[PDB]
Amino acid sequence: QSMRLLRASGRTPEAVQKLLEQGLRHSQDLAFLSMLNDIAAVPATAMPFRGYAVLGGERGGPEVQQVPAGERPLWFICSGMGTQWRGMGLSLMRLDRFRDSILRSDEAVKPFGLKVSQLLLSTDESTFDDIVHSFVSLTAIQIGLIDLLSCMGLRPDGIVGHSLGEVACGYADGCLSQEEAVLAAYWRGQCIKEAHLPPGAMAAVGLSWEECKQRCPPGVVPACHNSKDTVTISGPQAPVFEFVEQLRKEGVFAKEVRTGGMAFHSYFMEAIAPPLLQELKKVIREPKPRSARWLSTSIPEAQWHSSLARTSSAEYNVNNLVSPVLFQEALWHVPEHAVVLEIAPHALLQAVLKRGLKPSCTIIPLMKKDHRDNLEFFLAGIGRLHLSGIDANPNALFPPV
């Protein structure tokens, strides 16, 4: 239970180490650690060294570091599909704001006969093989994460989504409510499940976008633009498996990706638009406008001045499903010293993000697939916010003293 994050500030590295140690020696005094956390909110100007330690737990050990002058912008990246795993979010369930958010999500899905929390609890290995189970639970876990962030008063300067991640983005941007956001994830999944489409596949491929366009066999299209030389292509299964073989053989990095036989973000999805648009029309009534913080990955830049782009409509959401994921192009806009948080039940984009951004950007993941303890991992990440100059007091995550 008692595991807490202790953040420290000071004029020297030693000033910070001494603090981290006093807290370690009073690990069980919550009122004490609460007080030490309130203190750490001191500008780098005044105290240029910062540190953190996760008290309790295995990979507990201090990080200390000089904090740069300059203001650093905070960006949220909401990851897309593939990030599911059995036992997702069970460790974070210990934080009340998280489990409150997940129960609130269960309520959105009481009809339809699903409880997100029970999906998470399932010891059934194949529970997230179901597209609805996954979609809903990704987005619910993303909302939880966003709630934990907001509960420490962290407002994003920028927001960016990847496929289904763009649902979570709406929540983070204040376009879509929790209930709308979750239901959008539900219908997206349920519409597909019902559709019984032909067998498709997607593959990660070490070509550029234009090079894929040229080189891709008919019926196979570049789908997910993740970096200058990482495109996920999508199409009917056979050609996608054949194209990857061709590529492997010629020395190109070309990993297959499990998407449950589905050829996402391609023409294969157009059969799913009419039903989905009908359902989401009833869900997202009175569509609220997307802020300028939220860069679209479903709509090209040169048409951001657009009615479709103007709001997080049922229309915008259907467009996401059917259109390619223009992720690299959105990252291009992320400024030089950004602090970037991957908001996902598993930080799958970390590698892509490193490549698509620079040794100035700090990239922080929040959960890891099959981690012994994702509360430890989450808190270490929040600790790194301190180290990079962001004021995020963990006292909010925990019961008061």
Protein backbone atom coordinates (compact mmCIF):
# COMPACT_ATOMS: atom_id res chain seq x y z
CA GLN A 1 0.00 0.00 0.00
CA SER A 2 2.43 2.59 1.45
CA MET A 3 4.68 3.08 -1.63
CA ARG A 4 5.13 6.82 -2.36
CA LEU A 5 7.16 9.01 -4.72
CA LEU A 6 9.45 11.47 -3.01
CA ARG A 7 10.71 14.38 -5.08
CA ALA A 8 13.50 16.68 -3.89
CA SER A 9 15.06 20.03 -4.91
CA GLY A 10 18.29 21.85 -4.05
CA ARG A 11 21.31 23.96 -5.00
CA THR A 12 23.59 20.95 -5.35
CA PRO A 13 23.36 17.27 -6.17
CA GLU A 14 24.41 16.53 -2.61
CA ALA A 15 21.66 18.82 -1.27
CA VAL A 16 19.21 16.56 -3.14
CA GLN A 17 20.79 13.22 -2.18
CA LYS A 18 20.69 14.19 1.51
CA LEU A 19 16.94 14.90 1.10
CA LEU A 20 16.18 11.68 -0.65
CA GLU A 21 17.96 9.80 2.18
CA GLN A 22 16.05 11.54 5.03
CA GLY A 23 12.84 10.54 3.27
CA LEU A 24 14.07 6.97 2.83
CA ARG A 25 14.76 6.81 6.58
CA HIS A 26 11.22 8.05 7.30
CA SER A 27 9.53 6.08 4.47
CA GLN A 28 6.57 5.18 6.66
CA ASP A 29 5.85 8.75 7.85
CA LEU A 30 3.36 9.90 5.21
CA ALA A 31 2.72 13.33 6.73
CA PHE A 32 6.51 13.83 6.64
CA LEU A 33 6.90 12.73 3.01
CA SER A 34 3.81 14.80 2.05
CA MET A 35 5.56 17.82 3.51
CA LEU A 36 8.85 17.09 1.71
CA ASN A 37 6.91 16.89 -1.54
CA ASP A 38 5.19 20.29 -0.99
CA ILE A 39 8.69 21.76 -0.46
CA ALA A 40 10.20 20.49 -3.71
CA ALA A 41 8.14 23.02 -5.68
CA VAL A 42 11.03 25.49 -6.01
CA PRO A 43 12.01 26.94 -9.42
CA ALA A 44 15.35 25.79 -10.95
CA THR A 45 16.27 29.45 -10.84
CA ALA A 46 16.43 29.17 -7.05
CA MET A 47 17.30 25.44 -6.73
CA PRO A 48 18.90 24.09 -9.93
CA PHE A 49 19.18 20.43 -8.81
CA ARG A 50 16.26 18.04 -8.52
CA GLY A 51 15.87 14.35 -7.66
CA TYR A 52 13.34 11.62 -6.98
CA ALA A 53 13.03 8.23 -5.32
CA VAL A 54 10.18 5.73 -5.32
CA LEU A 55 10.04 4.65 -1.65
CA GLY A 56 8.89 1.03 -1.36
CA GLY A 57 9.40 -1.46 -4.19
CA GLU A 58 12.30 -3.08 -6.04
CA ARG A 59 13.68 -0.63 -8.63
CA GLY A 60 13.78 1.98 -5.88
CA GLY A 61 16.97 4.05 -6.25
CA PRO A 62 17.50 7.79 -6.48
CA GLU A 63 17.85 9.83 -9.63
CA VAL A 64 19.46 13.25 -9.18
CA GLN A 65 19.97 15.76 -11.97
CA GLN A 66 20.64 19.42 -12.85
CA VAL A 67 17.45 21.01 -14.15
CA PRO A 68 17.72 23.28 -17.18
CA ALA A 69 16.61 26.88 -17.20
CA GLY A 70 14.00 27.62 -19.85
CA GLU A 71 10.35 26.62 -19.87
CA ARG A 72 9.61 23.13 -21.16
CA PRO A 73 6.31 22.30 -22.89
CA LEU A 74 4.31 19.23 -21.90
CA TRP A 75 2.91 17.00 -24.62
CA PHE A 76 0.54 14.04 -24.31
CA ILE A 77 0.82 11.19 -26.82
CA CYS A 78 -2.08 8.73 -26.78
CA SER A 79 -1.07 5.45 -28.28
CA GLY A 80 -3.25 3.28 -30.43
CA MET A 81 -3.89 -0.37 -30.88
CA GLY A 82 -1.69 -3.32 -29.86
CA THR A 83 -0.96 -1.99 -26.41
CA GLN A 84 -3.23 -4.44 -24.56
CA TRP A 85 -2.02 -7.16 -22.17
CA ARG A 86 -3.47 -9.38 -19.46
CA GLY A 87 -3.45 -7.65 -16.08
CA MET A 88 -3.37 -4.15 -17.60
CA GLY A 89 -3.86 -1.47 -14.97
CA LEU A 90 -4.34 -3.78 -11.96
CA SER A 91 -1.36 -2.24 -10.17
CA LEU A 92 -2.56 1.31 -10.88
CA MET A 93 -5.96 0.31 -9.45
CA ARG A 94 -4.40 1.04 -6.06
CA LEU A 95 -4.66 4.79 -6.81
CA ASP A 96 -8.21 5.89 -5.99
CA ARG A 97 -8.53 8.42 -8.83
CA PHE A 98 -7.58 5.67 -11.25
CA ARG A 99 -10.02 3.08 -9.95
CA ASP A 100 -12.70 5.78 -9.68
CA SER A 101 -12.10 6.54 -13.37
CA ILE A 102 -12.26 2.87 -14.33
CA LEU A 103 -15.51 2.30 -12.36
CA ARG A 104 -16.97 5.39 -14.02
CA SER A 105 -16.01 3.78 -17.36
CA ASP A 106 -17.66 0.47 -16.32
CA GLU A 107 -20.84 2.52 -15.94
CA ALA A 108 -20.66 3.75 -19.53
CA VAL A 109 -20.55 0.05 -20.50
CA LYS A 110 -23.00 -1.46 -17.94
CA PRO A 111 -25.38 -1.80 -20.89
CA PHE A 112 -23.70 -3.87 -23.60
CA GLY A 113 -22.93 -6.07 -20.56
CA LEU A 114 -19.25 -5.25 -19.99
CA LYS A 115 -17.33 -4.22 -16.93
CA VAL A 116 -13.85 -2.88 -17.80
CA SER A 117 -12.64 -3.66 -14.30
CA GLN A 118 -13.62 -7.34 -14.77
CA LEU A 119 -11.80 -7.46 -18.11
CA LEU A 120 -8.68 -6.20 -16.35
CA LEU A 121 -9.18 -8.78 -13.58
CA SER A 122 -9.64 -11.67 -16.07
CA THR A 123 -7.01 -14.40 -15.76
CA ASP A 124 -8.16 -15.52 -19.24
CA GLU A 125 -5.19 -15.17 -21.65
CA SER A 126 -7.51 -14.59 -24.65
CA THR A 127 -9.75 -11.96 -23.00
CA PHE A 128 -8.23 -9.07 -25.03
CA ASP A 129 -8.22 -11.07 -28.29
CA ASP A 130 -11.75 -9.63 -28.51
CA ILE A 131 -11.60 -6.31 -30.34
CA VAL A 132 -14.28 -4.65 -28.17
CA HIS A 133 -12.64 -5.79 -24.93
CA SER A 134 -9.30 -4.32 -26.12
CA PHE A 135 -10.59 -1.06 -27.59
CA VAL A 136 -12.69 -0.20 -24.58
CA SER A 137 -9.98 -1.17 -22.09
CA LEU A 138 -7.18 0.73 -23.87
CA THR A 139 -9.24 3.87 -23.87
CA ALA A 140 -10.43 3.39 -20.29
CA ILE A 141 -6.84 2.90 -19.08
CA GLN A 142 -5.79 5.96 -21.06
CA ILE A 143 -8.56 8.00 -19.38
CA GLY A 144 -7.36 6.80 -15.99
CA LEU A 145 -3.83 7.88 -16.78
CA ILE A 146 -5.17 11.27 -17.95
CA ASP A 147 -7.14 11.58 -14.74
CA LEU A 148 -4.08 10.84 -12.60
CA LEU A 149 -2.18 13.52 -14.56
CA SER A 150 -5.00 16.07 -14.23
CA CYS A 151 -5.31 15.33 -10.51
CA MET A 152 -1.81 16.85 -10.18
CA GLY A 153 -2.92 19.88 -12.19
CA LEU A 154 -0.97 19.00 -15.32
CA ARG A 155 -2.45 20.74 -18.37
CA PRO A 156 -0.94 19.62 -21.70
CA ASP A 157 0.53 22.21 -24.07
CA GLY A 158 0.07 19.75 -26.95
CA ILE A 159 -1.87 16.55 -27.66
CA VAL A 160 -1.29 13.87 -30.33
CA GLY A 161 -3.06 10.55 -31.00
CA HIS A 162 -2.37 7.32 -32.84
CA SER A 163 -5.43 5.66 -34.45
CA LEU A 164 -7.74 4.81 -31.53
CA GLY A 165 -5.56 6.99 -29.29
CA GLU A 166 -7.32 9.97 -30.90
CA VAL A 167 -10.39 9.02 -28.82
CA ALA A 168 -8.39 9.51 -25.56
CA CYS A 169 -7.08 12.76 -27.11
CA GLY A 170 -10.60 14.15 -27.19
CA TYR A 171 -10.99 13.43 -23.50
CA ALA A 172 -7.64 15.09 -22.73
CA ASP A 173 -8.55 18.09 -24.89
CA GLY A 174 -11.99 18.57 -23.27
CA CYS A 175 -13.86 17.76 -26.50
CA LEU A 176 -15.32 14.45 -25.41
CA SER A 177 -16.58 13.42 -22.00
CA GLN A 178 -15.46 10.19 -20.40
CA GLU A 179 -18.77 8.57 -21.34
CA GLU A 180 -18.57 9.73 -24.98
CA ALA A 181 -14.92 8.77 -25.24
CA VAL A 182 -15.49 5.27 -23.88
CA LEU A 183 -18.57 4.64 -26.02
CA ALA A 184 -16.67 5.75 -29.12
CA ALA A 185 -14.10 3.04 -28.31
CA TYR A 186 -16.97 0.56 -27.81
CA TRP A 187 -18.84 1.22 -31.06
CA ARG A 188 -15.62 1.36 -33.09
CA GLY A 189 -14.90 -2.17 -31.84
CA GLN A 190 -18.46 -3.53 -31.90
CA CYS A 191 -19.14 -2.26 -35.43
CA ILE A 192 -16.01 -4.06 -36.72
CA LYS A 193 -16.79 -7.28 -34.78
CA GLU A 194 -20.27 -7.38 -36.40
CA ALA A 195 -18.93 -6.58 -39.89
CA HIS A 196 -17.33 -10.04 -40.54
CA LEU A 197 -14.82 -8.69 -43.13
CA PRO A 198 -12.38 -10.66 -45.32
CA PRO A 199 -9.05 -11.71 -43.80
CA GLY A 200 -6.55 -8.85 -43.75
CA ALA A 201 -3.15 -8.00 -42.29
CA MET A 202 -0.81 -5.12 -41.43
CA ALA A 203 3.01 -5.12 -41.29
CA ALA A 204 5.75 -2.81 -39.98
CA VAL A 205 8.05 -1.99 -42.86
CA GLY A 206 11.39 -0.19 -43.08
CA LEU A 207 10.52 1.97 -46.09
CA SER A 208 9.51 5.61 -46.34
CA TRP A 209 5.94 6.71 -47.06
CA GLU A 210 6.55 7.75 -50.69
CA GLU A 211 8.66 4.63 -51.23
CA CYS A 212 5.81 2.45 -49.91
CA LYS A 213 3.32 4.27 -52.15
CA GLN A 214 5.53 3.43 -55.14
CA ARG A 215 6.68 -0.02 -54.18
CA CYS A 216 3.41 -1.36 -52.62
CA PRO A 217 1.51 -4.10 -54.51
CA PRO A 218 -2.03 -3.30 -55.56
CA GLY A 219 -4.57 -3.44 -52.75
CA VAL A 220 -1.89 -2.87 -50.15
CA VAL A 221 -1.48 0.67 -48.91
CA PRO A 222 0.71 2.51 -46.43
CA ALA A 223 -1.46 2.97 -43.33
CA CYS A 224 0.50 4.13 -40.16
CA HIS A 225 3.26 6.70 -40.88
CA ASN A 226 5.33 6.46 -37.74
CA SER A 227 8.74 7.80 -38.82
CA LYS A 228 10.69 8.84 -41.93
CA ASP A 229 11.60 5.15 -42.50
CA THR A 230 8.88 3.30 -40.55
CA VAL A 231 5.54 2.81 -42.26
CA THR A 232 2.91 0.24 -41.32
CA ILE A 233 1.24 -1.00 -44.47
CA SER A 234 -2.20 -2.54 -44.53
CA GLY A 235 -4.21 -4.75 -46.92
CA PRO A 236 -5.47 -8.29 -47.63
CA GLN A 237 -3.44 -10.92 -45.69
CA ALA A 238 -1.67 -12.78 -48.52
CA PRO A 239 0.02 -9.81 -50.25
CA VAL A 240 0.99 -8.30 -46.90
CA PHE A 241 2.70 -11.53 -45.81
CA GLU A 242 4.29 -11.85 -49.29
CA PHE A 243 5.50 -8.25 -49.32
CA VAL A 244 7.19 -8.64 -45.99
CA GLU A 245 8.96 -11.77 -47.25
CA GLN A 246 10.17 -9.85 -50.31
CA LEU A 247 11.48 -7.12 -48.05
CA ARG A 248 13.13 -9.32 -45.40
CA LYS A 249 14.99 -11.03 -48.23
CA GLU A 250 16.39 -7.75 -49.52
CA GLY A 251 17.65 -6.60 -46.14
CA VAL A 252 14.76 -4.29 -45.16
CA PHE A 253 13.49 -4.35 -41.56
CA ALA A 254 9.93 -5.73 -41.91
CA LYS A 255 8.19 -7.06 -38.76
CA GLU A 256 4.57 -8.40 -39.00
CA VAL A 257 2.09 -6.91 -36.46
CA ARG A 258 -0.77 -8.76 -34.77
CA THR A 259 -4.02 -6.90 -35.49
CA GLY A 260 -6.43 -9.87 -35.26
CA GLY A 261 -6.73 -10.42 -39.02
CA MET A 262 -7.76 -6.81 -39.56
CA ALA A 263 -6.44 -4.39 -42.19
CA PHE A 264 -6.91 -1.16 -40.29
CA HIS A 265 -6.70 2.37 -41.67
CA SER A 266 -7.39 1.28 -45.20
CA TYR A 267 -10.26 0.80 -47.67
CA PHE A 268 -11.22 -2.43 -45.83
CA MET A 269 -12.79 -0.17 -43.16
CA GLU A 270 -15.15 1.81 -45.43
CA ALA A 271 -17.86 -0.86 -44.92
CA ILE A 272 -17.82 0.07 -41.21
CA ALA A 273 -18.35 3.84 -41.62
CA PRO A 274 -22.15 3.98 -42.19
CA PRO A 275 -22.98 1.85 -39.09
CA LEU A 276 -20.38 3.54 -36.89
CA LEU A 277 -21.41 7.04 -38.03
CA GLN A 278 -25.01 6.18 -37.12
CA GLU A 279 -24.04 4.96 -33.62
CA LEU A 280 -21.58 7.76 -32.84
CA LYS A 281 -24.11 10.36 -34.06
CA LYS A 282 -26.25 9.33 -31.05
CA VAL A 283 -23.21 9.22 -28.71
CA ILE A 284 -21.49 12.48 -29.63
CA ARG A 285 -24.37 14.94 -29.81
CA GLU A 286 -23.37 18.65 -29.99
CA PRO A 287 -19.73 18.05 -31.05
CA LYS A 288 -17.34 20.42 -29.24
CA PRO A 289 -14.40 21.95 -31.12
CA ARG A 290 -10.84 20.62 -31.00
CA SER A 291 -8.36 23.07 -29.47
CA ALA A 292 -5.20 24.25 -31.23
CA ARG A 293 -3.16 22.07 -28.82
CA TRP A 294 -4.53 18.91 -30.41
CA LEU A 295 -2.75 18.07 -33.68
CA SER A 296 -4.74 15.62 -35.82
CA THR A 297 -3.18 12.44 -37.10
CA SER A 298 -6.32 11.57 -39.13
CA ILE A 299 -6.48 14.80 -41.18
CA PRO A 300 -3.59 16.31 -43.17
CA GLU A 301 -2.25 19.66 -41.97
CA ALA A 302 -3.10 21.61 -45.09
CA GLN A 303 -6.81 20.85 -44.30
CA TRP A 304 -6.84 21.51 -40.54
CA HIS A 305 -8.82 24.61 -41.37
CA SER A 306 -11.74 22.23 -42.05
CA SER A 307 -15.26 21.48 -40.84
CA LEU A 308 -14.34 17.84 -40.27
CA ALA A 309 -11.19 18.97 -38.42
CA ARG A 310 -13.01 21.70 -36.47
CA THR A 311 -14.54 19.30 -33.92
CA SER A 312 -14.28 15.79 -32.48
CA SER A 313 -17.44 14.76 -34.31
CA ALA A 314 -18.85 11.29 -34.99
CA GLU A 315 -17.62 12.21 -38.47
CA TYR A 316 -14.05 12.97 -37.27
CA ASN A 317 -13.96 9.63 -35.48
CA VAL A 318 -15.15 7.66 -38.53
CA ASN A 319 -12.56 9.45 -40.64
CA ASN A 320 -9.84 8.31 -38.20
CA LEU A 321 -10.87 4.65 -38.60
CA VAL A 322 -10.73 4.76 -42.38
CA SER A 323 -7.86 7.20 -43.00
CA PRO A 324 -4.12 6.64 -42.55
CA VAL A 325 -2.36 7.56 -39.30
CA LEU A 326 -0.29 10.65 -40.09
CA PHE A 327 1.75 10.42 -36.89
CA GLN A 328 5.24 11.43 -38.07
CA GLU A 329 3.83 14.61 -39.59
CA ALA A 330 2.24 15.56 -36.27
CA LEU A 331 5.51 14.90 -34.38
CA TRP A 332 7.31 17.24 -36.75
CA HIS A 333 5.48 20.07 -34.89
CA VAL A 334 6.62 19.06 -31.42
CA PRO A 335 9.00 21.83 -30.24
CA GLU A 336 12.66 21.52 -29.30
CA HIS A 337 12.63 20.96 -25.55
CA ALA A 338 9.35 19.13 -25.15
CA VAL A 339 8.56 16.77 -22.31
CA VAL A 340 6.51 14.01 -23.90
CA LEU A 341 4.34 11.51 -21.98
CA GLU A 342 3.22 8.34 -23.65
CA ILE A 343 -0.32 7.70 -22.53
CA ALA A 344 -0.97 4.02 -23.02
CA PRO A 345 -1.33 0.82 -21.02
CA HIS A 346 2.06 -0.13 -22.65
CA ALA A 347 4.48 2.49 -24.00
CA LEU A 348 4.72 0.99 -27.47
CA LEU A 349 5.70 4.21 -29.28
CA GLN A 350 8.77 4.95 -27.18
CA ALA A 351 11.16 3.77 -29.92
CA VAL A 352 9.25 5.52 -32.69
CA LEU A 353 9.15 8.67 -30.57
CA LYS A 354 12.90 8.63 -29.90
CA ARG A 355 13.49 8.48 -33.65
CA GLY A 356 10.76 11.00 -34.56
CA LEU A 357 12.09 13.56 -32.03
CA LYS A 358 15.50 14.72 -30.78
CA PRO A 359 18.12 14.48 -27.91
CA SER A 360 16.52 17.68 -26.57
CA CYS A 361 13.08 16.03 -26.07
CA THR A 362 12.49 13.99 -22.92
CA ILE A 363 10.23 10.99 -23.56
CA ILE A 364 8.49 9.44 -20.56
CA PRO A 365 6.47 6.25 -20.56
CA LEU A 366 3.79 5.65 -17.95
CA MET A 367 3.10 1.85 -18.06
CA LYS A 368 5.02 -1.22 -19.31
CA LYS A 369 3.60 -4.55 -20.52
CA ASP A 370 3.87 -7.21 -17.82
CA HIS A 371 5.81 -4.95 -15.42
CA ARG A 372 6.11 -6.42 -11.90
CA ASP A 373 4.58 -3.21 -10.54
CA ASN A 374 3.28 -0.44 -12.84
CA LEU A 375 2.56 1.85 -9.87
CA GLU A 376 6.30 1.90 -9.26
CA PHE A 377 6.88 2.45 -12.96
CA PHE A 378 4.23 5.16 -13.22
CA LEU A 379 5.63 6.99 -10.19
CA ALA A 380 9.20 6.76 -11.54
CA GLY A 381 7.82 8.48 -14.64
CA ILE A 382 6.17 11.19 -12.58
CA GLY A 383 9.52 11.49 -10.78
CA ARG A 384 11.15 12.24 -14.15
CA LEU A 385 8.70 15.09 -14.67
CA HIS A 386 10.28 16.73 -11.61
CA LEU A 387 13.77 16.09 -13.02
CA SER A 388 12.83 17.73 -16.30
CA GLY A 389 11.40 20.85 -14.67
CA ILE A 390 7.65 20.09 -14.51
CA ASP A 391 5.77 20.68 -11.27
CA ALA A 392 3.83 17.50 -10.52
CA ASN A 393 3.15 16.87 -6.83
CA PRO A 394 2.34 13.18 -6.18
CA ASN A 395 0.60 14.00 -2.90
CA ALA A 396 -2.56 14.43 -4.98
CA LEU A 397 -2.48 10.78 -6.12
CA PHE A 398 -2.70 9.51 -2.56
CA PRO A 399 -5.06 9.79 0.42
CA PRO A 400 -4.55 13.02 2.40
CA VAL A 401 -2.67 13.33 5.76
